[PDB]
Ligand binder design. Structure first.
Ligand SMILES: *[B]([O])([O])[C]([C][C]([C])[C])[N]C(=O)[C]([C][C]([C])[C])[N]C(=O)C1=[C][C]=C(O[C])[C]=C1Cl
Ligand SMILES: *[B]([O])([O])[C]([C][C]([C])[C])[N]C(=O)[C]([C][C]([C])[C])[N]C(=O)C1=[C][C]=C(O[C])[C]=C1Cl
Ligand SMILES: *[B]([O])([O])[C]([C][C]([C])[C])[N]C(=O)[C]([C][C]([C])[C])[N]C(=O)C1=[C][C]=C(O[C])[C]=C1Cl
Ligand SMILES: *[B]([O])([O])[C]([C][C]([C])[C])[N]C(=O)[C]([C][C]([C])[C])[N]C(=O)C1=[C][C]=C(O[C])[C]=C1Cl
Ligand SMILES: *[B]([O])([O])[C]([C][C]([C])[C])[N]C(=O)[C]([C][C]([C])[C])[N]C(=O)C1=[C][C]=C(O[C])[C]=C1Cl
Ligand SMILES: *[B]([O])([O])[C]([C][C]([C])[C])[N]C(=O)[C]([C][C]([C])[C])[N]C(=O)C1=[C][C]=C(O[C])[C]=C1Cl
Ligand SMILES: *[B]([O])([O])[C]([C][C]([C])[C])[N]C(=O)[C]([C][C]([C])[C])[N]C(=O)C1=[C][C]=C(O[C])[C]=C1Cl
Ligand SMILES: *[B]([O])([O])[C]([C][C]([C])[C])[N]C(=O)[C]([C][C]([C])[C])[N]C(=O)C1=[C][C]=C(O[C])[C]=C1Cl
Ligand SMILES: *[B]([O])([O])[C]([C][C]([C])[C])[N]C(=O)[C]([C][C]([C])[C])[N]C(=O)C1=[C][C]=C(O[C])[C]=C1Cl
Lengths: 183, 182, 183, 184, 184, 179, 179, 179, 178
């Protein structure tokens, strides 16, 4: 990763212009970094927009909600820009950007689906894990319904299996507001 | 395994209608035990069969293959716990002919709820959870019928591993008698 | 596996003398070759007397299963099928394949039906060929199961979308078996 | 494998009735056994038909040709019966049965495709390996052309990728003569 | 981890630490506890009166590593606000409840999970007995503290932690693990 | 194993059972089966159980122990090489007056070993189980040897190696077998 | 890497080196570099050197869409090999400013992937990779002037082109002759 | 192993036992069983024990040693190839006057080896056990060879390789078997 | 590596060290160094030391084409060993300015590779590597003055040359005397 001397790595240089790059799977380490960058940018300027680029195959639901809740909590608008692919928790965070400021580039892909997990142990323990993942799915569907304007029942049906959308399809669905046309 | 010349030792016992269940219960063990029970019924439909059980348990469906065959055939199947009858082992111990379920004095019996795993989409985990919960209800109902304990008590007593002495298993209704030396 | 002396038989060979075949494992080509050989042997010994096929199987290969299925339908003797323990996936398909009126399950036996599974890796063209093959296989399985059960192809498709666990009595109601063998 | 006491394993008992079961991948060990079974049966009776059941995903080309050439060499007709699947060298051996006596059961699958292999080393060594596998494909296509009545050009096109056929499609192609229908 | 230049160069976490923010975003082990304790001691020395903000996104971890953090929080003079984002499970939720009373928060979609300790023991019966007594005494200590931090009885905590118990942020507030759900 | 019958099958004809390995469920199943077979052949004649074993599973050992006590024939026990742990427990289980060791055979006694993993409640259950198992073993060994439960508990806290003569003094055997 | 590291020094002159497989980390870096260069000067050309065996389609489209989005022209220069997503990005440079060195190789082929699971899941994955191929073919048609039908046929298997053949194909505009 | 008897079973008919491997519990159980079988067939006729062994477990060796000393028939021992460690101990255990080695056979003597891991107390118990084992081995070897315990202790401090003639001079065997 | 690190210090004097197998990472670095030096001074010679067992053909051609493209002369100096793609790059230096030290070794041979899959795929891979060999032989013929037919025979198997033999072959111009 190259250096820019004004010495910054390229990502730290973009962060100076309020750009955050989410370009990997979402785990607790990534979420801790993204959250810290959001809190830092709010402290630097509580009113100017932040730009969150998303190229992510997804990852942990709780790590994703750390980012989601921080976006909703802070005062600046967070624009979201999908490049490459926003899948699974990636597409959920894309839909979480400020309304009117959610974008995808024309050949970027969006994929939505239901949560996945594992459970092992006594019948009672499997029951607890199943109830938890089902309640998690309900919470995700309810929020995505609010962010897209689609009904919970439609979101549930449309996420039963992997569902791949073009940028234009994601706009029609309500996951983004605009397909970004070239400058 | 030694040989007996009039057989491996187990085949020689089978001639006397004794079946030795001395391992974990998987599909291979169940197929063998079921085949032995069917053979013994065909050889003599009226004489008792003796099923010795020293087993840590195993697959529920494999256990039910054995359980349903015991209940289906005409001869009574006596069950004799030696060493340990745990989990599906204790369920099969309790499945013997009423009045003919035994444990040796220092044999141990353990009962608990089923265990398993589930991986995949939330919908798939839900299907797996419902299946293991329905399996537990079926096991508990049958154990209630075999012991005389209420389903509610069986559910409470199997929440975690529950180790019983032979005398405790008799009091519980899992066996009929502790076998005294001859 | 114990021995029985009448010469000397292993327990399974002794049951085969009474026209009983035990299918008690996963279904692969080696198992299918053994089951088919036993069926052909029994038909040659007596083309009129019933055969008893016990099934305790988690399933396996579709093509290995169809070697067994087609042999059952081809030979002259009726093949009774008896589920003990579990008949899942290709196991339940073969259970439903027994002579009509002579398909049985023990009371606590489990039956599970679902759609085929597989894998494919390589170029897009190769993945397409593999996808078309498994989809055509599912259509064939559904058509036969409709014929064996009396259910419509549309209902079978819906009911096999995910793992579907049936009790012996439910399998009878579904048309997969004819009777529960009650003690 | 169960035993039959007349003591035979089940396969030895079928071999007494001139039935050979090919139920695995085709490698040198399987070919050696099948060839030995064919030679034995001819020695027992040079006039009576042999029955070769095929449920195979395929395997080695040279092991397959050991079986193929033995079938064509011996005097008895060898009937071939596809159950389950006959793929790749398996479908080639299915087509090698006596004409008029090649069968598939109704739900059996047949798959044809081109040979596969590997090559590693110097450019010259890769060239030799490529020429060998290409010549092998030409040999297979020519024989399959003769067994099916299809042109070499059509077989080449139809085997470029994995090509799955139903039993009825295999009859239409000329790989088998009849679909064995159940009395039922 | 990006850098911020103020020239003094900070990683992003060092920059937040300048504003008295500590980020606990991983499993809790001895290395993590040593870092957190050191940060808490550093912040107390910089200003013994100003609040500290401890963000918690953690699946839990070692009980003794957790108590190093817990005891340091209670020992130092500044109030430590705790803020759950994502998930506070197991030793994570214990530390969430350890924040200054009135200053324990969770974000609206954050999850809190409470349960009993887990461990392992191998060796002689005497050794297994010692390990069992130790983990049971550890559980009693945890329950007693959680009773004091939440206002719930020890008997209720024991029952509610028998198996994994997942709470929403609002349920955690009702339980007494936090004081408020932080609204946007 | 040479043929005569394999060598062990030939000894079994003379009512000799060789326990010469670790004790697991498979070994216990075989030994129990041999004991039941010998009782069915002749319910009055003595059985000879040779023991050279490092020990093994407690429940597998109790399957053997309870069968010895259940059947009618006396079972003589003969320690050759080593009888350790559950091996020494079975040695002490032979018919009183008919428990032997060869002069250079070793006997070792110690407490049970095991594992426990999971929630505190699960660890508690496993600990209680292994502790009750030790109490059961000590009670029986007390009855078999004449030593108090307190002495057995103290003496099995760690590995305790005994010579044949020491095993006789302890009450684990009745006689050291002289040539 | 010698010392700015050498790549950072080239970046000062608006030169980006894509010299590896294309994964999400590489795409994130290239996109960031492109965005940085546009912010420094929105009018001056950028030079993207490509020596790559290919990689992820979505990572490649992150770079592709950023190239088309920003205002500066991006020249592409193939050195060594541009294969698969590498050759797609080569064709993505500003028209008239796509180059290859005389002995550089270009290879085009269809996408590859995997699918595992239920028949329905395999169907979804197959449809996805097939739609991805249609999208790639459509864009490459626009970039080269070849028809979608021709691109489909020519990418059925690995198709290796010399620099001059790549110019004839329309993937580049000129073969770079020595200065 | 050629063949109805396998070759070893055929030799056992002539009262020949072949010890041709490392000595573990399985081997000891087999050798002991063969010795008991031969005594039961004929309590007066000599037994011939061939030894080609690198050694092995001390307790397994003593199961064989004590059985040799217990039974009524004389056991001749014949070293072919090598008798090392417990192998040489068993060679010396044959009937006095009937211990042989072939001319090019090797004999090796040394002290016991083992391992210990755990608490200081556990290491102490293991050390005391192996030291007492060494004392027992040296005492018996002194009786079998006529050498003093002090000399055996010195001569086994490290690996000590003897020719057949040296083993005779030492007292481990009685005669070298000449062709 | 002591520390400018020692290599960065040599680069200031227009010296590039190629001291490893040739893969894409190494080629990317060498190319960048060549472009940097040309931008610093388009007229002064560059010195490329080569101690390499060879490596990827396409990575080698990235370096080869950059050497031929830039304006400064690139001197090549073989120390230790130049094998395979290493010796190809040695021969690629400016004519009159290709050197080897007296005990350095040069080895030439044909390309190597692998191919797995359907017969058609093996055919494509075989054709590709054979065309690559033809391309390499043609360029080496131009750089050495040997016929393509002679290069083909001489590279059929591993062919080890002394520095003096490499000079006689035309792979280098001079053996560097102390
Ligand atoms: B996506 O693959 O990023 C998806 C989230 C979408 C549905 C919004 N991520 C998950 O579902 C993750 C996948 C793991 C492999 C990281 N699952 C969880 O975070 C999770 C949630 C709840 C439970 O309860 C048992 C388990 C799991 Cl693993
Ligand atoms: B016991 O440990 O033998 C127990 C049976 C008792 C409760 C009667 N066995 C099981 O519960 C087995 C354990 C496996 C490790 C073999 N569990 C099952 O057979 C089973 C049943 C149902 C499901 O549904 C998901 C899973 C499993 Cl794994
Ligand atoms: B069951 O698990 O036995 C199921 C069959 C049911 C639906 C009747 N078996 C399969 O679906 C098998 C699973 C493998 C792991 C053995 N799948 C196939 O046999 C099969 C069929 C078709 C294709 O085309 C790509 C692949 C596979 Cl793997
Ligand atoms: B099929 O998978 O049986 C196929 C034969 C068909 C085309 C008639 N088998 C092969 O192509 C085998 C595959 C191996 C994995 C066993 N390939 C060969 O026998 C073979 C032939 C020629 C060459 O020359 C290099 C290589 C190989 Cl591997
Ligand atoms: B939680 O998973 O963070 C939980 C703590 C809660 C109940 C407050 N953590 C533990 O219980 C840890 C889990 C390990 C995998 C790190 N357990 C211990 O720290 C611990 C405590 C006491 C004993 O005594 C044997 C063992 C263990 Cl492992
Ligand atoms: B000895 O090592 O044979 C000993 C028995 C003596 C004390 C009579 N064996 C055991 O203690 C075995 C050791 C295992 C490694 C096989 N332990 C058990 O059988 C046992 C008993 C009880 C519990 O409860 C947790 C566990 C175990 Cl593993
Ligand atoms: B090339 O090898 O870079 C090729 C892209 C060309 C055709 C433009 N890359 C791929 O095809 C990659 C290869 C992976 C091994 C990284 N494939 C994908 O990115 C991809 C696309 C779509 C699907 O759907 C199932 C899977 C995959 Cl893996
Ligand atoms: B020789 O290698 O056979 C030697 C015996 C001679 C000295 C008579 N064998 C041993 O010393 C064996 C070696 C093991 C690798 C099998 N040692 C023991 O049997 C033994 C004895 C006592 C102790 O106490 C801790 C340990 C061991 Cl391992
Ligand atoms: B030398 O080992 O550097 C040699 C180059 C000489 C002949 C000028 N390098 C290769 O031949 C390399 C070897 C690899 C192990 C890196 N081969 C290729 O670069 C190459 C070229 C073409 C093909 O087509 C299939 C494959 C390979 Cl691997």
């Amino acid at each position: 990763i190259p250096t820019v001397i004004e010495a910054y790595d390229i990502y730290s240089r973009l962060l100076k212009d309020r750009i955050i790059m989410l370009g990997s799977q979402i785990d607790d380490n990534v979420a801790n970094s993204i959250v810290s960058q959001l809190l830092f940018l709010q402290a630097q300027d509580s009113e100017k927009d932040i730009y969150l680029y998303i190229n992510s195959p997804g990852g942990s639901v709780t790590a994703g909600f750390a980012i989601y809740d921080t976006i909703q909590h802070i005062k600046p608008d967070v624009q979201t820009i999908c490049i490459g692919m926003a899948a699974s928790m990636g597409s959920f965070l894309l839909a979480a950007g400020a309304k009117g400021k959610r974008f995808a580039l024309p050949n970027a892909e969006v994929m939505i689906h239901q949560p996945l997990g594992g459970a092992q142990g006594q019948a009672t323990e499997i029951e607890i894990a199943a109830n938890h993942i089902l309640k998690t799915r309900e919470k995700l569907n309810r929020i995505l319904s609010e962010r897209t304007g689609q009904s919970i029942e439609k979101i549930q049906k449309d996420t039963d299996r992997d569902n791949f959308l073009t940028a234009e399809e994601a706009k029609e669905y309500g996951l983004i507001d605009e397909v970004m046309v070239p400058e």
